[PDB]
Design a protein around this ligand. Structure first.
Ligand code: K91
Ligand code: K91
Ligand code: K91
Lengths: 145, 142, 146, 144, 144, 146
């Protein structure tokens, strides 16, 4: 069930300058989510990372997947009417290639386990630019309090 | 031919944040045509103001994006005049067809018509092969 | 000759920072004309980028300022369509004569040409001045309302 | 004389978002300076002061006069080739009227005493909107 | 635990980003005294402009910070007047001793002098410290 | 004395606003350990978006902060490779215990595990505290030099 940005803002509480999901292109509740982040020079972090060379900070690639993963969780089960999800842990992150201004960051997050009893969700994540892997995440752990 | 990435764009244009609106130049033929792109993300400073309830890339910023791409072409076509500060002198026949939204890739093409430093150029911008903006004539001054 | 102060402009237009470019409306005649102003200060976020070595108000933002003023006139001339999100559909015959600089007061006048309850097609012309001298001309702004 | 924004930046080290003099319209070395700050909604402080009502922060009115004062000092005597001035004290500030988006803040600073390259300058300041007084400052004290 | 944290500060003050200059209120006594802090980081929007070559927290923003703290004390001391928009009406006897730099914790204390059941005028004094050392003094802040 | 603050940090790291997340280095021992701090204020540009209703310092930026402090250590431990652009190659075993809030002082310690200046491969561990209490743990940060 594809998606436009206004509806993302209804699901996630993130705003500027920390909303890092531009569009959700495919979603299957309780299973997988595919979305994208457009990487433009006209973004506030770029001036600091770095003046002489513009490279999207790896941590913000984590944040982007984590937000996409967080959308999946909130659509998969919103019985807990709390959209404030906090990152509890992340594991096995590997950055292969620099993400640069001009790139389309295509992202996929996959739900591993949900314990709606605690609020404990675990997800994996991969990000691509031009079909080539730029970031891998073995395991994102989330906790809505 | 060979890509002009963002670090090299900054060496041609004087524009900086928050008013550099060309992310990448993908093709250029001096004195003829230029193709580039602007990635449209929600994480841009203008989107909060246009509009809170619905994020739509301002039409005037699409003009600015094409104009900067057109400005690159001029400066690489003839840099005998060593001045990179090129002002907009006139624009004509602009038509916006479709809203440009967060998540889109704005693909842009500018075409040089006449160079004398009065340069005239035409411009088109696409999202998904669909035309979003047309510009008959951009006029620029040295 | 009812001025309009920034707070009431915000009630009409949906634009916010950093893209609201009308500071005050000084005169308005529904279905006819509107005069307002935009104060041009160095303390505006666009100036760092346009340009580092020389601050000049982006021509396009002069277009946007007139367009927003024009869009006020439209929404006060006829608000039966309770939609304040107006989109720019076309612009024609823009000519920039003089650079607009930090310190200037941009005085703006927009004039309604045609309005159609068609699908919300409004056409307007615009002129911007600094110190009584013309800095921007616009023959025709075309507005559509989603 | 006049002094543009490009030339202002040559004198003052202040940059965005803390340069609060747009134009210097009259200046007499060692005596008086008149300049202006254009107050627009399109300034970064206005979102925070305040969401429900945009009012230019008084402290920034102080800054603006102080920056204008600082220009006068640096053009009055630049033997000390240091443009980094610091505010050492301010006294007798009174805000009469709110300064709002749309206003032109016209500012005048008057040099009282200058003590060489000890570096102590004292100046007074007034700001106006529409010929009406918005801010008074009895004494700004600078370290050179 | 007579304190107030960021979220509850925002319930009291109308100030938002980039002009909210109180991070935490650590002690408060209605109608008497208030102690709070402002964390000073390089990651604040004003530092780019003040100054590119040397980051120093603008003195006027040290005035603002204390005044905001002072403003909290007023609003918690007497909220019968259900208006949280306090304007600075005057300030007097401000003296900056030492530069406040990125990395510092600005600890602030404001003390209520007079509150008028006649006017709507409050007068307060302020001191700001970094590492127990005095950085800013304010004899008198006047609020309406 | 071992005191390094923000002007000297900027000489070591290439990071600028809004992405320099180390305010002060309070202790450093080349090739071994580094201790520094980040002051957490409401007057930071990320807080508006994370989150409007509740200001909490994004976990990822806690990572970045420790990584930058780790990066200082590397560049002061061995600068034979005259390149200050360090990229994050991997991170492992991150756990966030407690929310970091406006008003907090984030105290940070990074410890060098292995350096192979041959390649440009450095591994480091990191811990962040607020009020002596652990807020973030990082088993392993891996950094490449390009
Ligand atoms: O926007 C502008 C409008 C009017 C002027 Cl006097 C200058 C402007 O800024 C520009 C500078 C340089 C280039 Cl190459 C531009 C290209 C297109 C549009 N504006 C440009
Ligand atoms: O700065 C200001 C100067 C003059 C005015 Cl008319 C208003 C100002 O903004 C403020 C509003 C409320 C409070 Cl409690 C303030 C506290 C300190 C500084 N400014 C404050
Ligand atoms: O605000 C400031 C307060 C304290 C310091 Cl240490 C510096 C400040 O910024 C300024 C720099 C230079 C000049 Cl000439 C100023 C003039 C007035 C106010 N602030 C000024």
């Amino acid at each position: 069930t594809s998606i436009d940005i206004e509806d993302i803002k209804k699901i996630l509480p993130h705003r500027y300058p920390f909303l890092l999901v531009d569009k959700v292109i495919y979603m299957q509740p309780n299973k997988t989510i595919i979305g994208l982040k457009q990487v433009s020079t006209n973004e506030p972090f770029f001036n600091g990372h770095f003046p002489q060379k513009q490279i999207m900070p790896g941590v913000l690639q984590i944040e982007a997947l984590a937000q996409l993963a967080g959308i999946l969780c909130l659509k998969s089960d919103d019985s807990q009417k709390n959209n404030l999800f906090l990152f509890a842990g992340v594991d096995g992150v590997r950055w292969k290639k620099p993400v640069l201004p001009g790139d389309t960051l295509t992202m996929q997050a996959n739900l591993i386990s949900f314990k709606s009893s605690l609020g404990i969700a675990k997800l994996s994540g991969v990000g691509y630019v031009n079909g080539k892997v730029v970031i891998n995440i073995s395991e994102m752990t989330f906790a809505l309090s």
